[PDB]
Design a protein around this motif. Sequence first.
Motif, short mmCIF file in Angstrom:
data_model
loop_
_atom_site.label_atom_id
_atom_site.label_comp_id
_atom_site.label_asym_id
_atom_site.label_seq_id
_atom_site.Cartn_x
_atom_site.Cartn_y
_atom_site.Cartn_z
N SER A 13 0.81 -1.24 0.00
CA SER A 13 0.00 0.00 0.00
C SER A 13 0.84 1.29 0.00
CB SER A 13 -0.96 0.00 1.19
OG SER A 13 -0.24 0.01 2.41
N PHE A 14 2.09 1.18 0.44
CA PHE A 14 2.99 2.34 0.51
C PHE A 14 3.93 2.45 -0.69
CE2 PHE A 14 1.94 4.43 4.38
CZ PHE A 14 1.66 3.48 5.35
N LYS A 15 3.79 1.56 -1.68
CA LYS A 15 4.72 1.54 -2.81
C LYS A 15 4.65 2.84 -3.64
CE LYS A 15 2.66 -0.78 -6.89
NZ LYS A 15 1.74 -1.70 -6.15
N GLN A 16 3.43 3.36 -3.78
CA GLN A 16 3.17 4.65 -4.39
C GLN A 16 3.79 5.80 -3.58
OE1 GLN A 16 -1.04 5.47 -4.60
NE2 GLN A 16 -0.82 7.15 -6.08
N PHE A 17 3.79 5.67 -2.25
CA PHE A 17 4.37 6.68 -1.36
C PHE A 17 5.89 6.80 -1.53
CE2 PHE A 17 5.21 9.45 2.09
CZ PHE A 17 6.11 8.86 2.95
N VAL A 18 6.59 5.66 -1.54
CA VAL A 18 8.07 5.63 -1.70
C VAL A 18 8.59 6.17 -3.05
CG1 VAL A 18 8.32 3.74 0.01
CG2 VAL A 18 8.22 3.18 -2.42
N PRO A 218 16.04 9.68 6.59
CA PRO A 218 15.69 8.73 5.52
C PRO A 218 14.77 7.60 5.96
CG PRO A 218 17.98 9.39 5.29
CD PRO A 218 17.49 9.93 6.64
N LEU A 219 13.82 7.29 5.10
CA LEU A 219 12.87 6.23 5.30
C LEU A 219 13.12 5.23 4.18
CD1 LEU A 219 9.05 6.47 5.23
CD2 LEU A 219 10.39 5.28 6.93
N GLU A 220 13.35 3.97 4.53
CA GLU A 220 13.60 2.94 3.56
C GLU A 220 12.52 1.87 3.68
OE1 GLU A 220 17.47 1.48 4.28
OE2 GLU A 220 18.51 3.33 3.73
N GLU A 221 12.15 1.27 2.55
CA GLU A 221 11.16 0.20 2.54
C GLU A 221 11.52 -0.89 3.52
OE1 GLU A 221 10.17 0.03 -2.06
OE2 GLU A 221 9.13 -1.61 -1.00
N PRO A 222 10.51 -1.51 4.16
CA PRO A 222 10.82 -2.71 4.95
C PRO A 222 11.45 -3.77 4.04
CG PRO A 222 8.61 -1.89 5.44
CD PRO A 222 9.08 -1.16 4.22
N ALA A 223 12.69 -4.18 4.32
CA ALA A 223 13.43 -5.11 3.42
C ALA A 223 13.14 -6.61 3.65
CB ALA A 223 14.94 -4.82 3.45
N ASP A 224 12.45 -6.89 4.76
CA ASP A 224 11.96 -8.23 5.10
C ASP A 224 10.56 -8.53 4.54
OD1 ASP A 224 10.33 -6.46 6.60
OD2 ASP A 224 10.67 -7.50 8.50
N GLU A 225 10.15 -7.80 3.51
CA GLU A 225 8.79 -7.91 2.94
C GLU A 225 7.68 -7.40 3.89
OE1 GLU A 225 8.16 -10.11 -0.43
OE2 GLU A 225 6.80 -8.35 -0.33
N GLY A 226 8.08 -6.90 5.05
CA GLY A 226 7.15 -6.31 5.98
C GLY A 226 6.70 -7.24 7.09
#
Length: 325
Positions: A13-18, A218-226
């Motif tokens: 859901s946050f892919k558009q945000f990043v 900096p905010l980075e995507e959760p790298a563990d798939e969340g």
Amino acid sequence: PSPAVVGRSLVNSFKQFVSHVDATYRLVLDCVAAVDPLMRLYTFGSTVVYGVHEKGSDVDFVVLNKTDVEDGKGGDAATQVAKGLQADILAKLARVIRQKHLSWNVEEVRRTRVPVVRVKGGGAVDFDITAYRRNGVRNSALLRAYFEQNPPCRWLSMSIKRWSKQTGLNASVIGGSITSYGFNLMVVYYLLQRNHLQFVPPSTIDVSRVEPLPPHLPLEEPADEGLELGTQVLDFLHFFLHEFDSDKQVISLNRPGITTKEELDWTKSAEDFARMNGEKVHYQWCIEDPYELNLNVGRNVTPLKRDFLRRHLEKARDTALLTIV
Ligand SMILES: Nc1ncnc2c1ncn2[C@@H]1O[C@H](COP(=O)(O)OP(=O)(O)OP(=O)(O)O)[C@@H](O)[C@H]1O
Ligand SMILES: [Mg+2]
Ligand SMILES: [Mg+2]
């Protein structure tokens, strides 16, 4: 659904945000200076708490005098003259903003506990300006310091804020009971309870030592798939349904561990006596403000709204915070 399932939907859901605030800060300081070249501009709210400015969030600003900043740990007066002083400076500033920006809606908002000027410009350029108060900058620095200890926890808070605005729990929606700030306090309280965070005494926050405009974080995507996100979300929901005792306990950052309603006198007898903003305060869902004296952040949570909250908390488990269609 499992934590992984929940974590996947959320990262999804946050892919558009990043896939910024400097210039707005400067545009506002241009106005502040025109009123008084010695007046400072401080930022606070989500921009500061997260170190990131979200689309669909305003910016919170406060105008401070040099002596307000140097009294870096002083409390804010809750007097009628304090409020008169704040209104007076804000009126002047409002007049300057309208002058310099004919296209902006500049609203002098008088509904409220704290005098505020609300500015909507159209370029999704939205901000609140207040005056002569440290508590907003202190509570945001406090929350920032917490999220600086464990940066990925901002995704839990960000997930809870968006859900609250989408379900009508957030005070920004008609019928809503708890501000975004309220939700942040709940996230941190929860994180403290589970040891994902180390206690920070609110008194150690010193406004004379904060940045007027703190750096981006900096905010980075959760790298563990969340997985950890999804795990934190379900545990957060469980905690506030089955562990936190809203009848006996206060969500508080003023001390580690449990604060009781009894020690604050946040009881049924206090509601009879207790007014705020010129209306009833409720003590059904208690969230202690870490700086203001005797302030329940959940003061608007009536028994009905407390019902609504529990129901949405229950429902959020199955839908991963409204992300499973
Ligand atoms: N219920 C409340 N009681 C007292 N002060 C509040 C309350 N809600 C907000 N505030 C003040 O306003 C400031 C910004 O709050 P706000 O609710 O806008 O949170 P935010 O994190 O900026 O989220 P948003 O993205 O919704 O703007 C806070 O630092 C706090 O001082
Ligand atoms: Mg805000
Ligand atoms: Mg707000």
